[PDB]
Enzyme design. Structure first.
Site, PDB file in Angstrom:
ATOM      1  N   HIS A   1       0.803  -1.226   0.000  1.00 24.20           N
ATOM      2  CA  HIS A   1       0.000   0.000   0.000  1.00 24.20           C
ATOM      3  C   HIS A   1       0.834   1.272   0.000  1.00 24.20           C
ATOM      4  O   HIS A   1       0.289   2.369  -0.172  1.00 24.20           O
ATOM      5  CB  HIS A   1      -0.937   0.063   1.216  1.00 24.20           C
ATOM      6  CG  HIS A   1      -1.947  -1.036   1.259  1.00 24.20           C
ATOM      7  ND1 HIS A   1      -2.846  -1.256   0.238  1.00 24.20           N
ATOM      8  CD2 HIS A   1      -2.191  -1.988   2.189  1.00 24.20           C
ATOM      9  CE1 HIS A   1      -3.616  -2.286   0.542  1.00 24.20           C
ATOM     10  NE2 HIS A   1      -3.237  -2.750   1.720  1.00 24.20           N
TER      11      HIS A   1
ATOM     12  N   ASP B   1      -2.443 -10.904  -1.950  1.00 26.48           N
ATOM     13  CA  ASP B   1      -3.011 -10.310  -0.731  1.00 26.48           C
ATOM     14  C   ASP B   1      -4.469  -9.942  -1.027  1.00 26.48           C
ATOM     15  O   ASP B   1      -4.790  -9.565  -2.169  1.00 26.48           O
ATOM     16  CB  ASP B   1      -2.188  -9.078  -0.326  1.00 26.48           C
ATOM     17  CG  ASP B   1      -2.618  -8.482   1.002  1.00 26.48           C
ATOM     18  OD1 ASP B   1      -3.683  -7.827   1.058  1.00 26.48           O
ATOM     19  OD2 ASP B   1      -1.860  -8.610   1.975  1.00 26.48           O
TER      20      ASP B   1
ATOM     21  N   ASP C   1      -4.031 -12.876   3.781  1.00 29.89           N
ATOM     22  CA  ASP C   1      -5.277 -12.424   4.384  1.00 29.89           C
ATOM     23  C   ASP C   1      -6.518 -12.777   3.550  1.00 29.89           C
ATOM     24  O   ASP C   1      -7.631 -12.478   3.971  1.00 29.89           O
ATOM     25  CB  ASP C   1      -5.243 -10.907   4.728  1.00 29.89           C
ATOM     26  CG  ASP C   1      -4.640 -10.035   3.648  1.00 29.89           C
ATOM     27  OD1 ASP C   1      -4.330 -10.545   2.543  1.00 29.89           O
ATOM     28  OD2 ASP C   1      -4.469  -8.817   3.939  1.00 29.89           O
TER      29      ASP C   1
ATOM     30  N   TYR D   1      -3.450 -12.232   8.888  1.00 36.66           N
ATOM     31  CA  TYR D   1      -3.585 -11.884  10.300  1.00 36.66           C
ATOM     32  C   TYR D   1      -4.048 -13.005  11.203  1.00 36.66           C
ATOM     33  O   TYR D   1      -4.067 -12.834  12.418  1.00 36.66           O
ATOM     34  CB  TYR D   1      -4.527 -10.668  10.418  1.00 36.66           C
ATOM     35  CG  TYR D   1      -3.996  -9.569   9.548  1.00 36.66           C
ATOM     36  CD1 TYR D   1      -2.867  -8.843   9.937  1.00 36.66           C
ATOM     37  CD2 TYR D   1      -4.559  -9.308   8.303  1.00 36.66           C
ATOM     38  CE1 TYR D   1      -2.319  -7.886   9.116  1.00 36.66           C
ATOM     39  CE2 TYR D   1      -4.019  -8.338   7.463  1.00 36.66           C
ATOM     40  CZ  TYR D   1      -2.901  -7.636   7.877  1.00 36.66           C
ATOM     41  OH  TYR D   1      -2.365  -6.684   7.056  1.00 36.66           O
TER      42      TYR D   1
HETATM   43  C1  LIG Z   1      -5.470  -1.519   6.825  1.00 36.81           C
HETATM   44  C2  LIG Z   1      -6.001  -2.924   6.665  1.00 36.81           C
HETATM   45  C3  LIG Z   1      -5.246  -3.943   5.909  1.00 36.81           C
HETATM   46  C4  LIG Z   1      -3.993  -3.851   5.456  1.00 36.81           C
HETATM   47  C5  LIG Z   1      -3.543  -5.018   4.650  1.00 36.81           C
HETATM   48  O1  LIG Z   1      -3.591  -6.177   5.038  1.00 36.81           O
HETATM   49  N1  LIG Z   1      -3.127  -4.675   3.427  1.00 36.81           N
HETATM   50  O2  LIG Z   1      -2.673  -5.539   2.439  1.00 36.81           O
HETATM   51  C6  LIG Z   1      -7.211  -3.290   7.115  1.00 36.81           C
HETATM   52  C7  LIG Z   1      -8.199  -2.430   7.868  1.00 36.81           C
HETATM   53  C8  LIG Z   1      -9.153  -1.754   6.883  1.00 36.81           C
HETATM   54  C9  LIG Z   1      -8.947  -3.395   8.742  1.00 36.81           C
HETATM   55  O3  LIG Z   1      -9.734  -4.200   8.254  1.00 36.81           O
HETATM   56  C10 LIG Z   1      -8.675  -3.401  10.216  1.00 36.81           C
HETATM   57  C11 LIG Z   1      -9.347  -4.301  11.032  1.00 36.81           C
HETATM   58  C12 LIG Z   1      -9.096  -4.318  12.396  1.00 36.81           C
HETATM   59  C13 LIG Z   1      -8.186  -3.425  12.952  1.00 36.81           C
HETATM   60  N2  LIG Z   1      -7.957  -3.439  14.293  1.00 36.81           N
HETATM   61  C14 LIG Z   1      -8.659  -4.391  15.144  1.00 36.81           C
HETATM   62  C15 LIG Z   1      -7.025  -2.495  14.886  1.00 36.81           C
HETATM   63  C16 LIG Z   1      -7.519  -2.516  12.134  1.00 36.81           C
HETATM   64  C17 LIG Z   1      -7.763  -2.500  10.765  1.00 36.81           C
HETATM   65  K   LIG Z   2      -3.940  -8.112  -4.070  1.00 31.66           K
HETATM   66 ZN   LIG Z   3      -3.962  -7.219   2.917  1.00 36.51          ZN
END
Ligand SMILES: CC(/C=C/C(=O)NO)=C\[C@@H](C)C(=O)c1ccc(N(C)C)cc1
Ligand SMILES: [K+]
Ligand SMILES: [Zn+2]
Ligand SMILES: [Cl-]
Ligand SMILES: [K+]
Ligand SMILES: [N+]
Ligand SMILES: [N+]
Ligand SMILES: [N+]
Ligand SMILES: [N+]
Ligand SMILES: [N+]
Ligand SMILES: [N+]
Length: 356
Positions: A134, A172, A265, A305
């Site tokens: 990103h 991803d 993910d 994750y």
């Molecule tokens: C930024 C991102 C992924 C990045 C990625 O993986 N990019 O490739 C996902 C956000 C929208 C999200 O879904 C999220 C969910 C829970 C959270 N906390 C529980 C703190 C924080 C953020």
């Molecule tokens: K992708």
């Molecule tokens: Zn991602």
């Protein structure tokens, strides 16, 4: 040499969220993956490649001097200034260790690309964090500071030739907006992303991720977005996208190096992705990519994750790189997945004869 490289350095665990120790982009993402490689006796079969710091000159292959300066300045910030700086970006946390960790993630991948291109190894896996795809030329985003995969493509070109053909496959679950933008006018780097989109409701929430964004100028046709809409997707959809789109286009491009922006993910069990790709699914995707570029494939950790899911999934990929037989896995596609695939086919048929 018919050898698989592996890079991992526990120093990349030091990047952390001081305000929320349970933030999903955890230090133990990379240690859990590394441990699973040891448990499955994969680690001992790999050639260990050392991590190193990227240099600021290397970061400037893709990033502005101001962006590099800003992230470097966080090394000596007090907590409230780290909070302030992080908040200037979409979905970023920063600690005093973040800059160094981001440098190690990039430098690890440069050493891996070098090992491949000098013939020391055939292929390689990089267990690195923070992620990169990103990150834009001029800004951090989405847990990413510097665009590790994009930098690695430019680094590869810098030790071979400017026009070295690099394929970046980004599986991803999120769109690699930074990677797309860095290469949007480039025909030397083919960017193919599969990602959940939901008409813009899914992060990073931009129409830049839609199938009709095919590249600009001489890069027209060299940006392939495969956006998913309508909820859960899994092995059938990803296998069909590889069958109909990723592999025919990749073969026509004839890459000299393949980089995988390998977030896990989209895996079964991931709370951020909501998809169902299985470890066996990732193994088949890997095995397909191994048919390209005389096997010169570098798998780079991005997101992912669920600690158990990412550990099992990335280990399966390394098993494929090592030459192990693919596990056994036709289920009909979700109707919206058929719609997505046909949309991309329509968008890219003007550029790729293999789709006609
Ligand atoms: C930024 C991102 C992924 C990045 C990625 O993986 N990019 O490739 C996902 C956000 C929208 C999200 O879904 C999220 C969910 C829970 C959270 N906390 C529980 C703190 C924080 C953020
Ligand atoms: K992708
Ligand atoms: Zn991602
Ligand atoms: Cl500093
Ligand atoms: K491109
Ligand atoms: N082992
Ligand atoms: N170092
Ligand atoms: N402070
Ligand atoms: N773009
Ligand atoms: N090819
Ligand atoms: N199709």
């Amino acid at each position: 040499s018919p050898i698989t490289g592996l890079v991992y350095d526990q120093r990349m665990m030091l990047h952390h969220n001081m305000w929320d120790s349970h933030h999903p982009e955890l230090p133990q993402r990379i240690s859990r993956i590394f441990s699973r490689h040891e448990e499955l006796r994969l680690l001992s079969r790999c050639h260990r490649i050392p991590a190193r710091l990227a240099t600021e000159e290397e970061l400037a292959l893709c990033h502005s001097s101001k962006h590099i300066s800003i992230i470097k300045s966080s090394e000596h910030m007090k907590p409230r200034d780290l909070n302030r700086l992080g908040d200037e970006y979409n979905s970023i946390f920063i600690s005093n260790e973040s800059y160094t960790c981001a440098l190690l993630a990039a430098g690890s991948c440069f050493n891996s690309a070098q090992a491949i291109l000098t013939g020391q190894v055939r292929n390689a896996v990089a267990i690195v964090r923070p992620p990169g795809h990103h990150a834009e030329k001029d800004t951090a985003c989405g847990f990413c500071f510097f665009n590790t995969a994009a930098l690695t493509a430019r680094y590869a070109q810098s030790i071979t030739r400017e026009s070295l053909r690099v394929l970046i496959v980004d599986w991803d679950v999120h769109h690699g907006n930074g990677t797309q933008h860095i290469f949007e006018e480039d025909d030397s780097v083919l960017y193919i992303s599969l990602h959940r989109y939901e008409d813009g409701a899914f992060f990073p929430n931009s129409e830049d991720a839609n199938y009709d964004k095919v590249g600009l100028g001489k890069g027209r046709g060299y940006n392939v977005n495969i956006p998913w809409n309508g909820g859960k997707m899994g092995d059938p959809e990803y296998m069909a996208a590889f069958h109909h789109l990723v592999m025919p286009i990749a073969r026509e491009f004839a890459p000299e190096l393949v980089l995988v922006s390998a977030g896990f993910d989209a895996a079964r069990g991931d709370p951020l992705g909501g998809f169902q790709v299985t470890p066996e699914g990732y193994a088949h995707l890997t095995h397909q990519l191994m048919s390209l570029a005389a096997g010169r494939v570098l798998i780079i950790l991005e997101g992912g994750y669920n600690l158990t899911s990412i550990s099992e999934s990335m280990s399966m990929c390394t098993s494929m790189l090592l030459g192990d037989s693919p596990p056994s896995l036709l289920t009909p596609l979700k109707t919206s997945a058929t719609v997505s695939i046909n949309n991309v086919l329509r968008a890219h048929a003007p550029f790729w004869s293999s789709l006609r």
